[PDB]
Write a protein that binds this ligand. Structure first.
Ligand SMILES: CNC(=O)Nc1cccc(-c2ccnc(C)n2)c1
Ligand SMILES: [Cl-]
Ligand SMILES: [Cl-]
Length: 182
């Protein structure tokens, strides 16, 4: 009831509509992207510096690292929202890589509607240090977006892009898109 056709608008980029949202995947360095929100896949202490989290915390800078540790000591958080630091975004949302990926993406979408944001960029959450399987992660990310659209919750959010470090993981996302296509 929601899926459009899969195509390639630019070299190495693949896209399809999911209701009112354009869903895109590409390989590359997420720290070079511009979006209202960039997502970090981190540990339950919000201080992982390995895999994509290393690059995100290094490029964001020490004020963002300090925001993370300040919030982590205040309460038990499922995820935290910080400034963008020196990344090209308005906020970073730091999710726990080992948590249920569908739940994490649903939370990101809801927080972006609360701020009237239009664009999101995320990694293949959980496929690094957490060692969740890439097929299960792709299925969960796309299921979260489908549920958000089905409930009529997409109003401000218009574009969700997954920028993936390993080309072999991109291939798994593309196959999942083709399974769903209208
Ligand atoms: C959430 N997925 C990952 O963390 N995946 C993953 C796997 C292997 C390496 C990297 C990575 C990314 C940027 N910088 C560096 C030094 N390493 C990322
Ligand atoms: Cl991870
Ligand atoms: Cl990734």
């Amino acid at each position: 009831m929601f899926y459009g056709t899969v195509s390639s608008p630019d070299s190495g980029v693949y896209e399809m509509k999911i209701g009112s949202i354009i869903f895109q995947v590409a390989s590359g360095d997420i720290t070079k992207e511009e979006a209202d929100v960039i997502v970090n896949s981190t540990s339950n202490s919000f201080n992982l510096k390995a895999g994509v989290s290393k690059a995100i915390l290094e490029c964001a800078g020490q004020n963002v690292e300090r925001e993370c540790s300040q919030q982590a000591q205040q309460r038990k958080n499922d995820y935290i929202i910080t400034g963008g630091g020196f990344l090209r975004c308005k906020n970073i949302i730091h999710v726990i890589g080992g948590n249920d990926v569908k739940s994490s993406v649903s939370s990101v979408l809801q927080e972006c509607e609360k701020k009237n944001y239009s664009s999101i960029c995320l990694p293949a959450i959980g496929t690094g240090n957490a060692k969740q399987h890439p097929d299960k992660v792709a299925e969960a990310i796309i299921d979260a977006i489908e549920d958000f659209v089905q409930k009529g919750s997409a109003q401000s959010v218009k574009k969700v892009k997954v920028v993936i470090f390993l080309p072999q993981v991109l291939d798994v996302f593309y196959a999942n898109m083709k399974k769903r296509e209208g």
